[PDB]
Design a protein around this ligand. Structure first.
Ligand code: NA
Ligand code: NA
Lengths: 183, 183
């Protein structure tokens, strides 16, 4: 109620600490020293380092997604809204890969309804023909955040151009959109 | 050369230890005690617990994928090969989620050429019309191993039926296959 305002202020600061310093190497002692708080002050809001990460991620993605909705120009068609939202954006140790995975999952879950809305708008305009708008939104986001992640798959830098092309091709098929939609 | 035969025999045994006991809670001391080997015997083949996991995963997936190729019936059409291969199959703490992620990534990388071959066969038969066979194979596997993973996304059990339906719909669009292909 009031506890929520304080917890998210800290989560925001923890985000900056995890990004700037890495998740694996950030200790609860480093966090509290950097924040200027005690162990007790931290344990009042979080039970673990994982919860600190989840709170940092939730608040960052909740913010980023809300700033996409407020920045959305009134009356834009679905094709332009899709193009605009696709261009949006905020060591590879096992724990650092978990922080990245958590972030991909949160982005997918927060952006899926926005993309679902765009897809539904396009079905109504007659530019797409998608049977399952929310599932298709989640499908697209999974491809953009897992398949196009070169660090996840250790994809070669010279192969990324073909993956983006293949991604656009897939988007066209899935949406039943015109072939020149993403040109 | 000869070192490889021994290393993969251990990797196979480590796999069983990680599955039966969980990755997070499996200590290097538990591994060596269960295997009947010394710390030195283990450090001769692996530098870390992560490398033990990667070796266990590589050898399991390399095996599983090779047993799919040997079990493949001679002269099956692409539609039946696809249906057959789709039915194939071997705590949620941060480290356990890494073991699972590593496994998903290895399955995708080992099975992609098999699915690419099936897709190419179908393009030749005239049952599919896919511009990028290997990228499309990787796209499909990403959806079956990330999007359909209810533990990754914490999807509701009652929503899984719609996700499978949406997955099949997507497969049909991506492959340019007939609508009754997966019935
Ligand atoms: Na859903
Ligand atoms: Na590739």
């Amino acid at each position: 109620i009031n506890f929520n305002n304080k917890r998210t202020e800290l989560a925001n600061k923890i985000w900056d600490i995890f990004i700037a310093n890495g998740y694996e190497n950030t200790t609860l002692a480093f966090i509290i020293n950097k924040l200027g708080i005690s162990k007790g002050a931290l344990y009042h809001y979080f039970s673990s380092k994982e919860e600190c990460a989840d709170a940092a991620i939730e608040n960052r993605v909740a913010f980023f997604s809300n700033e996409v909705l407020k920045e959305s120009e009134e009356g834009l068609n679905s094709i332009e809204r899709l193009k605009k939202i696709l261009l949006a954006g905020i060591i590879n140790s096992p724990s650092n890969k978990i922080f990245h995975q958590k972030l991909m999952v949160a982005i997918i879950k927060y952006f899926a309804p926005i993309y679902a809305d765009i897809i539904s708008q396009g079905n109504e305009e007659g530019v797409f023909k998608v049977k399952y708008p929310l599932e298709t939104a989640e499908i697209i986001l999974t491809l953009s955040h897992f398949y196009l992640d070169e660090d996840l798959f250790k994809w070669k830098k010279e192969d990324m151009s073909l993956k983006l092309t293949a991604f656009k091709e897939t988007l066209i098929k899935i949406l039943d959109a015109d072939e020149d939609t993403f040109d």
